[PDB]
């Protein structure tokens, strides 16, 4: 049973297996009840690897612990073996965070990896499942490759598999499989889920300083909520065991196949338990992660919310608290276009390039590969650096802890100081979910026509007393300086002379309108007011100029962040 046979299985192609930018995601039920659905897709991935290069290739494999993960990993082993892939490196119990996969790929020079995650989407018998493909730079497979995978998947007629091959995912070390009538063996290395990632962080951060910060009587008190997802053992082994945080610091840090029956998506309501804990006033710092660990929410004492747009700005403004950046220097900053302009204030002051990209990883990855990007952020709870090629939630937490250690102030005092220094970008995102597509499309088309008129620049909007003047209005376009691609229709931007912006996007069962409001204030009498009060005038202007209520019938957003 260490010696196994290779067989060819006739199959019937499916027509909807698009790998997308974040992976193929379907209901678990779909993978289970659709004959050869997973097999087809995994074969299609492996078929993108040239036969001549398969024996010397390694794929990194692991996922976020959700229901069906281990069955999918076994299936990946069976098919990779049969196809002549020489080696898989698999996290113990199948567990690898998305940042750990990126880490390991780059460390061992793997050709890529397959990540079993659907990120922040629910899991369990009635939940979702996802299959994500990363390539040799440790980042998401780009469109040319996902296109090829899709094309193969649509006409596949057979796949190769070792049906009797079974991996013990629970035990560390090398397992070898001899394939019938194949000269070279198939090798699986089970590795500790945390070690490589922790060794990376140990080099990036000053663990001595952090241990001192987190240990003993005068310690910074923290609560870190992995939301029953993949980052749990990382918190326990790094923050608690290595850096000495009391075990109670690790909240929901046992991976559960259904993430405890909840969505592992960090925000004020999905992580309401963490927020309520922080409200007691006993802890200095709180954070929550999404299911696969590339998203993070940051909280201060009393449940003070650091919005993600501000978070990346504060990290930029204190970036040399982190040993990694002392060594590399700061190669550049970037944020997605709908993210608030807080980062740009820091970049301008420190005279570092600011790249404003369309939504999507590929734009950050390109700039990092060009040695032009050290720190990036997205308003959707995303923060990262060029240490790897995925965003990294726990990395962002250790960045914050490093800054707290050097500043010796509370989270809230650091933000107040920041706002006083740079001005404040009040920020919110309104989501209108499942709106009728016809109305939403008409809303966008009509608004863009309005904005394109010659007289629209210079138009004034009263608040009142306060007057907003349109400086620039367009449909965002981006020419990538690395791959030369031009991305068009990336969002309607109303840019005002006082540094403020309104941005409209349609999401990529009914459309989702995303409305981003970025209101800049410099006045001391304004920067510490209530955010929804300070944002109300631009929100009003946004709804009036777009006629959103009139076009969609919505009097209120579905979600406010
Ligand atoms: Mg994620």
Swiss-Prot record:
The modification N6-acetyllysine is found at residues 18, 351. Changing residue 390 to K: In CDG1T; decreases strongly solubility. Its EC number is 5.4.2.2. GO terms for biological process: carbohydrate metabolic process; galactose catabolic process via UDP-galactose, Leloir pathway; gluconeogenesis; glucose metabolic process; glycolytic process. Phosphorylation at Thr-469 by PAK1 significantly enhances enzymatic activity. Keywords: Acetylation, Carbohydrate metabolism, Congenital disorder of glycosylation, Cytoplasm, Disease variant, Glucose metabolism, Glycogen storage disease, Isomerase, Magnesium, Metal-binding, Phosphoprotein. It catalyses: alpha-D-glucose 1-phosphate = alpha-D-glucose 6-phosphate; O-phospho-L-seryl-[protein] + alpha-D-glucose 1-phosphate = alpha-D-glucose 1,6-bisphosphate + L-seryl-[protein]; alpha-D-glucose 1,6-bisphosphate + L-seryl-[protein] = O-phospho-L-seryl-[protein] + alpha-D-glucose 6-phosphate. Its cofactor is Mg(2+). The modification Phosphothreonine is found at residues 117, 187, 469. It holds the Pfam family PGM_PMM_III. GO terms for cellular component: cytoplasm; cytosol; extracellular exosome; extracellular region; ficolin-1-rich granule lumen; tertiary granule lumen. Binds 1 Mg(2+) ion per subunit. GO terms for molecular function: magnesium ion binding; phosphoglucomutase activity. CDD domains: PGM1 (cd03085). The active site is at 119 (phosphoserine intermediate). Mg(2+) binds at residues 119, 290, 292, 294. Monomer. It is linked to Congenital disorder of glycosylation 1T: A form of congenital disorder of glycosylation, a multisystem disorder caused by a defect in glycoprotein biosynthesis and characterized by under-glycosylated serum glycoproteins. Congenital disorders of glycosylation result in a wide variety of clinical features, such as defects in the nervous system development, psychomotor retardation, dysmorphic features, hypotonia, coagulation disorders, and immunodeficiency. Catalyzes the reversible isomerization of alpha-D-glucose 1-phosphate to alpha-D-glucose 6-phosphate. The mechanism proceeds via the intermediate compound alpha-D-glucose 1,6-bisphosphate. This enzyme participates in both the breakdown and synthesis of glucose. This is Phosphoglucomutase-1.
């Amino acid at each position: 049973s260490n010696m196994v046979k290779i067989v060819t299985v006739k199959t019937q192609a499916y027509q909807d297996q698009k790998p997308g930018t974040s992976g193929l995601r379907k209901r678990v039920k779909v993978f289970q009840s659709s004959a050869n659905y997973a097999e087809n897709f995994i074969q299609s991935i492996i078929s993108t690897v040239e036969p001549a290069q398969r024996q010397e290739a390694t794929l990194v494999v692991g996922g976020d612990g959700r229901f069906y993960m281990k069955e999918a990993i076994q299936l990946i082993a069976r098919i990779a073996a049969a196809n002549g892939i020489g080696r898989l490196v698999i996290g113990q119990n199948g567990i690898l965070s998305t940042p750990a996969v990126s880490c390991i790929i780059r460390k061992i020079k793997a050709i890529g990896g397959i990540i079993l995650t659907a990120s922040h989407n629910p899991g369990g018998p009635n939940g979702d499942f996802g299959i994500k493909f990363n390539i040799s730079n440790g980042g998401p497979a780009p469109e040319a490759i996902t296109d090829k995978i899709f094309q193969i998947s649509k006409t596949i007629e057979e796949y190769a598999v070792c049906p009797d091959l079974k991996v013990d995912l629970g035990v560390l070390g090398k397992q070898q499989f001899d394939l019938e009538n194949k000269f070279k063996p198939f090798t699986v290395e089970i590795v500790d889920s945390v070690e490589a990632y922790a060794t990376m962080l140990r080099s990036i951060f000053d663990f001595s300083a952090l241990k001192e910060l987190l240990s003993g009587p005068n310690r910074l008190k923290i609560r870190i909520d992995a939301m029953h997802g993949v980052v749990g053992p990382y918190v326990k082994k790094i923050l608690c065991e290595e850096l000495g945080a009391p075990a109670n610091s690790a909240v929901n840090c046992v991976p559960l196949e259904d993430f405890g029956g909840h969505h592992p998506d960090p925000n004020l309501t999905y992580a309401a338990d963490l927020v309520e804990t922080m409200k007691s006033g006993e802890h200095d710092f709180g954070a929550a992660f999404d299911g696969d660990g590339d998203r993070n929410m940051i909280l201060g004492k009393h449940g003070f919310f650091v919005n993600p747009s501000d978070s990346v700005a504060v990290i930029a403004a204190n970036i040399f608290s982190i040993p990694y950046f002392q060594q590399t220097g700061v190669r550049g900053f970037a944020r997605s276009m709908p993210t608030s302009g807080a980062l740009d204030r820091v970049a301008s002051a420190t005279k570092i390039a600011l790249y404003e990209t369309p939504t999507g990883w590929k734009f950050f990855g390109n700039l990092m590969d060009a040695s032009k990007l050290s720190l990036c952020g997205e308003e959707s709870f995303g923060t990262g650096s060029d240490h790897i090629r995925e965003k990294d939630g726990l990395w962002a937490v250790l960045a914050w802890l490093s800054i707290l250690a050097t500043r010796k102030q509370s989270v809230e005092d650091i933000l107040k100081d920041h706002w006083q220094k740079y001005g404040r970008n009040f920020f919110t995102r309104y989501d209108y979910e499942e709106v009728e597509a016809e109305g939403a499309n008409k809303m966008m088309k009509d608004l863009e026509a309005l904005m394109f008129d010659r007289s629209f620049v210079g138009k004034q909007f009263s608040a009142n007393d306060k007057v907003y003047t349109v400086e620039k209005a367009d449909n965002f376009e981006y020419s990538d300086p690395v791959d030369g691609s031009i991305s068009r229709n990336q969002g309607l931007r109303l840019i005002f002379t006082d540094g403020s912006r309104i941005v409209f996007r349609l999401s990529g069962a009914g459309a989702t309108i995303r409305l981003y409001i970025d209101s800049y204030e410099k006045d001391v009498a304004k920067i510490n007011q209530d955010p929804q009060v300070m944002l109300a005038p631009l929100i009003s202007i946004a709804l009036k100029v777009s006629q959103l209520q009139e076009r969609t019938g919505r009097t209120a957003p579905t979600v406010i962040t």
